[PDB]
Amino acid sequence: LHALLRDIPAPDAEAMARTQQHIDGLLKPPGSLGRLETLAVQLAGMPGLNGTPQVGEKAVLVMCADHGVWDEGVAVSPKIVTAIQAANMTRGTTGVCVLAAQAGAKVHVIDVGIDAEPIPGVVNMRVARGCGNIAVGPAMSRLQAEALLLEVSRYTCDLAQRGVTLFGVGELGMANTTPAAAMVSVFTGSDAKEVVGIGANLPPSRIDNKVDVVRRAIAINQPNPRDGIDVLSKVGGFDLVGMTGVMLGAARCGLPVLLDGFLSYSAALAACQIAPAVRPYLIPSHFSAEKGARIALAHLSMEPYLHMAMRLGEGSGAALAMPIVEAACAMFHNMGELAASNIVLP
Amino acid sequence: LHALLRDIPAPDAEAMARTQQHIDGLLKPPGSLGRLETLAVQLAGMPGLNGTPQVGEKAVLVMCADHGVWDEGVAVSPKIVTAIQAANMTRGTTGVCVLAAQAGAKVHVIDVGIDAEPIPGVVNMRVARGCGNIAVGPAMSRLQAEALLLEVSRYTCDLAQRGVTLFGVGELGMANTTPAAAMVSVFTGSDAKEVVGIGANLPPSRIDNKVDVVRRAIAINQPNPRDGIDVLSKVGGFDLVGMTGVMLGAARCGLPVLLDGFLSYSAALAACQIAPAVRPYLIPSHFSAEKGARIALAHLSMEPYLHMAMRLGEGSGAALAMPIVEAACAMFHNMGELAASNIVLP
Ligand SMILES: O=C(O)c1ccc[n+]([C@@H]2O[C@H](COP(=O)([O-])O)[C@@H](O)[C@H]2O)c1
Ligand SMILES: O=C(O)c1ccc[n+]([C@@H]2O[C@H](COP(=O)([O-])O)[C@@H](O)[C@H]2O)c1
Ligand SMILES: Cc1ccc(O)c(O)c1
Ligand SMILES: Cc1ccc(O)c(O)c1
């Protein structure tokens, strides 16, 4: 693992400089394509993309797991919805399945801790049947967190060897906006009330309890904010750990990763805390409607491309943004050049 | 024309209600897909879409023309760039050409007033070789404005008969952010300084002059803010009129129209002023980096889906947003239903 984190490649400044020069010469006023140009340069800096903004195969990894804190009354969805929805993922009927298909991406359903029997068709990497209730203790041990990190990391970069050049990250797990809020509170240093949201339609009357639970998880576990792995293992969850692992794996592989919503933001905070070298490989997708989204994004210093008020999860936002990444590549490789049309602009 | 404006169909509330009910029953927490759900309902209300959110063929109409006000030193791009770029449109090398291709849409280059010889391959609807200099008088007569409105309207709805169900609007014309700023100032009642931007990389030192020109155009022409056609003919342009015509045509045809950037916003302001019944058919795409974008959008009461800091024009934003409209349709027709999985959520 330490080896893994040590070998994460830095961005290729040489390719980035060649990228900028080429973009500036395209048939358009310099900088007129804004963030689409900035995106193309970012991609060209990623060693796995072979010195140029390109997109081969696309995959969306969905980490599924249950949480013990569900028993604290912080989620109104029946706990079995995690297992049922994970099954539907294999039938291509879920939101991410439909949005991925539209983007020509393949969805990978990974079970990292669903509290139910194994689901055939789903990748089995389950640590246990749900994580511990963070309200009364840790969600898992440090070893378990590190093991899943390494496991997911390997799985991700292994896909790269099969032609995948762009990843999307996602999750599925009733009650996960609670540990996510806890993680965001710890990493950003914001009060719990400022980052706890409604999750999957939690009644306004039940918010207070959710906030108290988050505070309790922090007070009792005392997670160290300067140790991402310590935070993940204490007030996190299997699914959150898994998303963090996809991010480390893709970074080590020198490939881009599209974030999704609020849950992904907390995993990104952990990942950047564990290995800052991961930041250059992260690409935002949409701005989640979850209350703590703004705060999380600011500390990540990210500005989402899509404002859809979405709050579904599954990596649905990620899939929705994939066409945008391909547009930056198409812009780069297919546009004509000013010099060719004898056009001279200041 | 009055007949045209009289026959614009109202939205189908019955289809919209059936849409909402269906969306609420999909495999997801109610409302979790946010604006993607709202979009699907809007589409279902449009008579031309046959009571359901769907997308057949897609077209992007690009209105090209030159402006007399270019002589006031408000644009740093050589005037011939309009004609040259219009030609490149027929070669598929421009920004909108590349983004449209990625979205499977066809680009329609329409010359409504380029100051140059006719360009083969380009649809000819030119009123004159550039419009009058709005700084010293009107850009065109009311008759010319109305004629082009009717002409473009007919062209647009005629395409609908060929299988097109989704339109994108765009333009091309050096110095057009000036008349656009003037129109926005008149319609919103904002001071010129608050809505005049840099356009296509106008040096900060030359902004003052641009603002004075805009004010002069208004003072000398005295456009009536309660008469969209009066505004368009006086301080507008052929390209702006054309975009307004696409919007009226699609509305009459009961079909959706995707706006693009700042120039499109001013044409949308005119269109809604001329016929309020057009509003329900308008769909925002991106948030233009032009200074007056926020003000224009607020008066249109619209919130763009994409934040890309783009300011190219050509309808490039429109094309970029087409995949989003198709995603709302895919969501609607392809997702599974809660009742089928025996899932019951509050
Ligand atoms: O991705 C988001 O921004 C997001 C925001 C709110 C809720 N969710 C989804 O809803 C679940 C978490 O909500 P909850 O109320 O059970 O804590 C989980 O399965 C997520 O996929 C997801
Ligand atoms: O679409 C926008 O928001 C947009 C914002 C700024 C500039 N433009 C493009 O640049 C031109 C207008 O810029 P300008 O400086 O000549 O007034 C015109 O050809 C547009 O296509 C377009
Ligand atoms: C070359 C160029 C100059 C100005 C524009 O608005 C454009 O779309 C292209
Ligand atoms: C049916 C359902 C419930 C909660 C979710 O987070 C989800 O993606 C789907």
Are B169 and B21 contained in the same domain?
A: no
Q: Is A308 one of the annotated binding-site residues? A: no
Q: Which two tokens stand for residue A226?
A: 């300067």
Are B321 and B340 contained in the same domain?
A: no
Are B342 and B299 contained in the same domain?
A: no
Pocket of ligand 4 (CB under 6 A): A 77, 81, 85, 172, 200, 312-314; B 27-29, 343
- Contact state of A34 with B289 under an 8 Å Cβ cutoff: yes
Q: Which ligand is nearest to the CA of B170?
A: 2
Are A100 and A143 contained in the same domain?
A: yes
**Chain B residues 270-309 within an 8 A CB cutoff of chain A:** 289, 303-309
Give residue B95's region: left, alpha or beta (phi > 0; psi -120 to 50): alpha
For residue A112, report the phi and psi dihedrals to the nearest 5 degrees.
-110, 0
Are A3 and A62 contained in the same domain?
A: no
| Long-range pairs of A192-196 with CB within 8 A, sequence gap ≥ 24 | A192/A218, A194/A291, A194/A292, A194/A295, A195/A291, A195/A292, A195/A295, A195/A296, A196/A291, A196/A292
Are B137 and B39 contained in the same domain?
A: no
Are B193 and B207 contained in the same domain?
A: yes
- Its domain, for residue B297, covers 55-326
**Chain A residues 247-266 within an 8 A CB cutoff of chain B:** none
Q: Supply the CATH number for residue B46's domain.
A: 1.10.1610.10
Q: Which two tokens stand for residue B294?
A: 């926020």
Angle between helices A316-334 and B316-334 (to 10 degrees): 150
Residues with Cβ within 8 Å of residue A298, at least 6 apart in sequence: none
**Chain B residues 179-238 within an 8 A CB cutoff of chain A:** 200-201, 203
Rounded to whole angstroms, how far apart are CA atoms B9 and A143?
A: 64
C-alpha B301 chain-centroid distance: 15
Are B46 and B99 contained in the same domain?
A: no
Tell which residue, A40, A46, A189, A164, has the closest CA to residue A105: A164
For residue A170, report the phi and psi dihedrals to the nearest 5 degrees.
-160, 170
| Mutate which of A24, A27, A338 for ligand 3 pocket (most atoms within 8 A of beta carbon) | A27
Is residue A72 part of the annotated active site? The answer reads no
Q: In a 3-state reduction of DSSP, which class is residue A220?
A: helix
Q: Is A262 one of the annotated binding-site residues? A: yes
| Amino acid in position A58 | K
Tell which residue, B28, A162, A116, A100, has the closest CA to residue A108: A100
* Closest Cα to atom 22 of ligand 2: B313
Q: Please tell me what DSSP assigns to residue B80.
A: T
Taking CA–CA distances from B92, the nearest residue in chain A reads A335
Residue A49 near residue A165, CB atoms below 8 Å: yes
- Rounded to the nearest angstrom, the minimum Cα separation between A144 and chain B is 31
- Contact state of B32 with A78 under an 8 Å Cβ cutoff: no
- Rounded to the nearest angstrom, the minimum Cα separation between A95 and chain B is 6
Are A92 and A189 contained in the same domain?
A: yes
Q: Is B288 one of the annotated binding-site residues? A: yes
Are B304 and B334 contained in the same domain?
A: no
Q: Which of A151, A314, A326, A337 is catalytic?
A: A314
Rounded to whole angstroms, how far apart are CA atoms B307 and A107?
A: 26
Domains held by chain B: number: 2
Residue A176 near residue A68, CB atoms below 8 Å: no
Are B134 and B63 contained in the same domain?
A: yes
Task: Write down the residue that tokens 């719990």 correspond to.
Answer: A192
Are A17 and A91 contained in the same domain?
A: no
Rounded to whole angstroms, how far apart are CA atoms B60 and B322?
A: 10
Residue A236 near residue A179, CB atoms below 8 Å: yes
- Rounded to the nearest angstrom, the minimum Cα separation between A293 and chain B is 15
Q: Please tell me what DSSP assigns to residue B68.
A: G
**Resolution in angstrom units:** 2.1
Q: Which residues of A touch B101 (CB under 8 A)?
A: 330, 334
For residue A113, report the phi and psi dihedrals to the nearest 5 degrees.
165, 40
Q: Which of B72, B151, B290, B314 is catalytic?
A: B314
Residue A203 near residue A142, CB atoms below 8 Å: no
CB-ligand 3 contact for B177 (6 Å cutoff): no
A78 — contact with chain B (CB < 8 Å)?
yes
B323 — contact with chain A (CB < 8 Å)?
yes
